[PDB]
Design a protein around this nucleic acid. Structure first.
Ligand SMILES: [Zn+2]
Lengths: 143, 61, 36, 149, 129
RNA sequence: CGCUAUUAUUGGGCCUAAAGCGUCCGUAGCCGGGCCCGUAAGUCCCUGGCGAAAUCCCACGGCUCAACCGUGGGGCUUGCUGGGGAUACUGCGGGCCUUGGGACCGGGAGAGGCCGGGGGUACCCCUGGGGUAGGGGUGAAAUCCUAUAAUCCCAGGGGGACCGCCAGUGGCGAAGGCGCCCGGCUGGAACGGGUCCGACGGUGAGGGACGAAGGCCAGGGGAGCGAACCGGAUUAGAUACCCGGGUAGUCCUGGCUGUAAAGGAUGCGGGCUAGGUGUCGGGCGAGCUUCGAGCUCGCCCGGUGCCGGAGGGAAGCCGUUAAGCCCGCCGCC
RNA sequence: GAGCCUGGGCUCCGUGAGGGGGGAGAAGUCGUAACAAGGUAGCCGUAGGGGAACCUACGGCUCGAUC
C-alpha cells in the first residue's frame, strides 16, 4: 500500500532499507568490494607492455565473414597471457615474435569486447616504441 | 437533515397487567423475561428482535 | 529450492520438472564422491 | 468483531444525546442504588443488572439518574470484584476448554480458540497493570487459575 | 485504524469538490479542523461552515463554492523557520503567491504570510489551492 | 559525477513484464480517537561566547585591462554552549468521555472440529441349486477366465473402502480443507440491544502454531485401483500411448518430513469517490393464506456473485468485494 | 626484552593422477519432447523408471480447444 517507513522518528529504519537494497545494483557492489581490480590482468591501468609469442587469426561472428588478425602477448607485470587485435590493413606484417608491444583497451561496452570479435578485450598501440598508425601509413619505420 | 445522528428504534412502554390491574413501564426489545412486580405474571416475552406483548399497552413514551 | 516461474514457460527450453530431476541427480553424485 | 476474524460487524446500541434524566422515570437516585445492591446480592453481574433495570424497572442510563456508575456504586459498598469481569469470564472459558482438550487431544481446531482466548487475556493483563487494577507482576497460569473459579 | 482526522477531512473535501457536491459532512471533529476551516473561510475557499452537536463528538457541515483545486495535510509535520518558506512553497504550490500553507505557531494557527509578517516559524500541517 | 524517477526523503515499483512470505497469533520497534488543567523536554523568536587563516560571492582600488594581489561587506565552518520569552503541535504528569476495540444477555443459521452407536447401495471371494459353450477386450485383435463346468440367474455367509440423486452460480472455516443418520462435548461469526468496561488499538524484524498429495519410522489391516515389474499388440523401432495381470501405496493408531499453478498469480487495518439486478442469513413493515418454522412485495445491517457510468491503466481489463484519491506499518524486486 | 627454535589458531597463493558439470563455436549422429485439440491437452509438486529429449502414478491449477 502506502510506502513505509514514513514517520517522523523512523530515521534509521530508512537508512537500513536503503543500505539493504543498495546491494542489488552491481555498480555499487563491484566498486565497494573491488572485484575488477582483483580479476584485472592490467592491475588497474590504462596501458601495459608485453612480448609477442604467437601470431594468429580469429573468425568473425555471424552473420559476418572475415578473419581478424591478433597476437598472444605475455605481460611483464605479472606474466599473464592475453590476446590483442592488430588494427589496420597489413598491421600484422609490421610485427614479429619477441617484439615488445604496448596494449590498450579496445573500446566496448563495460570495458569489454567490441563489435564482431568477442573474446578480445585489448588492442595494440605501439611496436618497439613506434606507432602502428605511422607504420601502416608509411611515415615511420620499425628499428 | 440526513441520517447523521443515530436514534434508537426501540421505545419504552407503559402497560397494564390484565390480572391485577397494576401499571408498569417496560422495554420493547427485552433480552430477559419481563414480569409484573406485584403478582409475578408474564408481561412481555423475549425474542430475537421485538418482544411479544402479553398485556395491554396504555402509552408509548 | 527457490523457483522462478519464468522458467516454467516452455519456449526455447526443455520442461522445468525434468531439469529439477537432473539437478538433484548431479548433486547426489557430487555429494557421494566426496564421501558424505 | 475484527480482532482476529476480520469482519465488519455493526450490531450495537444507539443512544440519544441526552444531558439529563427524562421526566417519566418513577424511582429516584437513592432507590436505583438499592436495587443495584439487591440484584448484586441475588448474584448477577453488572451487565445483567443493567439489562434487568432497563427491561423490568424501566431505568435507562443509570448514569443519568445517578452521577456514578454501577462499579463505583459497588466499590462504595463492600461488593467490588477483585479480578475484573472480562478477565474472569475469559479465564473460565479457557479453564473449561483445557479440561476438555485433555480428553479430546486431536480436536486441533479448538486449541486455536484456546490460543486466541489466551491472547485476549494477555492484552487485558497488560492494560490493567498500567492502571493498577492488578499488581505490577500479575501473570496468568492455567494451574494457578483453576483456583480462581 | 484512524490516525489523523484532518487528512480524512481534507481528502473528503477534495473528492467532493472534484465530483461537484454542495455540502460536506465531517464526522470526527476537533479544534484544529475548526481553525483550518476558519483560515480557509477568511481566504475565500469555502462558505458557511457550522458545528453540529451529537453526544459522541462534533460534526462539521461545510458548503463549497468551486474555488478549490487541491487540499491536503502535510505529513510529517515539518518544523520550519522564518527563513526557509520559499522551499516549501516551491514544493507544495504552483506559483509564487498561489494558495496557502497553514502553519501552527505559538500564537495560533495562521497562514505563512501572517507568520512571516510577524517574524516567526512553527510546524506545517496543511496546504490548499 | 551527470545522463538514471536504473537506489527513488523530495521521487520508483510488486494480477499478466523482475517482484506479496502457504496462512495465522504475537516480542522489541514504528504509527496511534475526543475535551480539560499543569510542566516546558522537543519545536519557535530575541540575545551573549565560540566555530583559525587560505578557499567561495559582491563592490572599490594597484600591476595596460584580466588572470593575480589588497581594503571592506557577506556567507562556509553540516554545529556546541550561557540566558530571557511564547505555548499551537508532539512528549511527560493528573482528571473526564464514548464514537474504535473487547465482555455479556436473547432468538436463529451453518458439510466448522472430536467421540460413541446405527445403517445404504454397489463391488470382490466362498459355499449350495439351475444351465451349456463360449466369456471378456479392441480401431481390429490377441495374451487372460472356461468343460476340474466359465460368463449368466437364484438362495445364503464373509470382508474392506465410500456415502450417489437432492447439490446450488449455494454454506462454515485463518488457510489447508469439510457432504448418510441419531446422541454427547467443543470453537468462531452475523443480527437485535438507552446492557457492562472505558482507547484497552494497527502492523509486526527475530521467535512460534497449523499446514494437500507423496515419502519415511513403528505397529495392524488389505475389497477395488494401481508407480515399479511382467506379458500381448501397434510401430522403421516403441524402454510409451491401447489390452490383460501385479508389488509398494491408498485405510486405522502414534510420530517425523514442512513442501505445490499452496493462485483472486492481487499483504493487513481505516476514512472518502453514481448506481442497477440476483442469491444467503438475521431483523422491521405491509398484504395473502390451505393458518404451516408457510407465500409475495418493500426497507436496514452483514456476506457472496453478475453488469455498468465517471475515473484509472501499456493494453487485456479493474471499476464502493478497485488494479482510484488520502492516513499508516511489514515482506519483497 | 630483541632474535632463534618449537606447537597451535586464523588467513592468501601455486600445483596435482583422475573425474564433474557450464558457456561459445559454419557444417556431424540418433530420435521428434514443445508451440494448432502440435497427433496421448499442457504445466506445478512428490516418488519410481528409461539411450536422450522424455514416460507413468497420486493430489492440484487453467496460463485448456469442441459440443
Ligand atoms: Zn399482575
Amino acid at each position: 500500500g502506502k510506502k513505509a517507513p514514513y514517520g517522523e522518528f523512523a530515521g534509521r529504519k530508512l537508512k537500513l532499507k536503503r543500505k539493504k537494497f543498495r546491494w542489488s545494483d552491481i555498480r555499487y557492489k563491484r566498486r565497494v568490494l573491488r572485484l575488477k581490480e582483483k580479476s584485472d590482468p592490467l592491475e588497474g591501468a590504462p596501458q601495459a607492455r608485453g612480448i609477442v609469442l604467437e601470431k594468429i587469426a580469429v573468425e568473425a561472428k555471424q552473420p559476418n565473414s572475415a578473419m581478424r588478425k591478433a597476437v598472444r602477448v605475455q605481460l611483464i607485470k605479472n606474466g599473464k597471457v592475453v590476446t590483442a587485435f592488430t588494427p589496420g590493413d597489413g598491421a600484422i606484417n609490421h610485427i614479429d615474435e619477441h617484439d615488445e608491444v604496448i596494449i590498450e583497451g579496445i573500446g566496448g561496452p563495460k570495458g569489454g569486447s567490441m563489435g564482431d570479435i568477442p573474446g578480445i578485450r585489448y588492442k595494440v598501440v605501439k611496436v618497439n616504441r613506434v606507432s602502428l598508425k605511422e607504420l601502416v601509413k608509411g611515415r615511420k619505420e620499425k628499428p | 437533515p440526513k441520517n447523521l445522528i443515530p436514534m434508537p428504534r426501540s421505545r419504552f412502554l407503559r402497560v397494564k397487567c390484565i390480572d391485577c390491574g397494576n401499571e408498569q413501564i417496560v422495554f420493547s426489545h427485552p433480552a430477559t423475561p419481563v414480569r409484573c412486580l406485584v403478582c409475578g405474571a408474564t408481561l412481555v416475552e423475549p425474542t430475537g428482535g421485538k418482544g411479544i406483548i402479553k398485556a395491554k399497552v396504555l402509552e408509548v413514551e | 529450492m527457490k523457483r522462478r516461474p519464468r522458467k516454467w514457460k516452455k519456449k526455447g527450453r526443455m520442461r522445468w520438472k525434468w531439469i529439477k530431476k537432473r539437478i538433484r541427480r548431479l548433486k547426489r553424485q557430487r555429494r557421494k564422491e566426496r564421501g558424505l | 468483531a475484527r480482532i482476529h476474524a476480520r469482519k465488519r460487524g455493526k450490531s450495537g446500541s444507539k443512544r440519544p444525546p441526552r444531558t439529563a434524566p427524562p421526566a417519566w422515570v418513577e424511582y429516584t437516585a437513592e432507590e436505583v442504588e438499592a436495587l443495584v445492591v439487591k440484584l448484586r446480592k441475588e448474584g448477577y453481574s453488572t451487565a445483567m443488572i443493567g439489562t434487568i433495570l432497563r427491561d423490568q424497572y424501566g431505568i435507562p442510563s443509570v448514569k443519568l439518574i445517578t452521577g456514578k456508575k454501577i462499579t463505583k456504586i459497588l466499590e462504595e459498598n463492600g461488593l467490588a470484584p477483585e479480578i475484573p469481569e472480562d478477565l474472569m469470564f475469559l479465564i473460565r472459558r479457557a479453564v473449561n476448554l483445557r479440561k476438555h482438550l485433555e480428553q479430546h487431544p486431536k480436536d486441533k481446531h479448538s486449541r486455536r480458540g484456546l490460543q486466541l482466548i489466551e491472547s485476549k487475556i494477555r492484552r487485558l493483563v497488560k492494560y490493567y497493570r498500567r492502571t493498577g487494577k492488578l499488581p505490577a507482576k500479575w501473570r496468568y497460569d492455567p494451574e494457578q487459575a483453576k483456583l480462581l473459579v | 485504524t484512524l490516525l489523523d482526522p484532518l487528512a480524512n477531512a481534507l481528502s473528503h473535501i477534495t473528492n467532493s469538490e472534484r465530483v461537484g457536491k454542495k455540502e460536506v459532512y465531517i464526522k470526527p471533529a476537533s479544534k484544529l479542523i475548526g481553525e483550518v476551516l476558519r483560515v480557509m473561510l477568511e481566504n475565500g475557499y469555502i462558505g458557511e461552515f457550522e458545528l453540529i452537536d451529537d453526544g459522541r463528538a462534533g460534526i462539521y457541515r461545510v458548503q463549497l463554492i468551486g474555488k478549490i483545486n487541491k487540499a491536503g495535510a502535510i505529513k510529517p509535520r515539518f518544523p520550519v523557520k522564518a527563513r526557509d518558506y520559499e522551499k516549501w512553497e516551491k514544493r507544495f504550490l504552483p506559483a509564487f503567491e498561489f494558495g496557502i500553507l497553514i502553519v501552527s505557531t505559538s500564537q495560533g494557527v495562521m497562514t505563512h504570510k501572517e507568520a512571516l509578517e510577524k517574524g516567526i516559524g512553527g510546524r506545517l500541517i496543511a496546504y490548499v489551492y
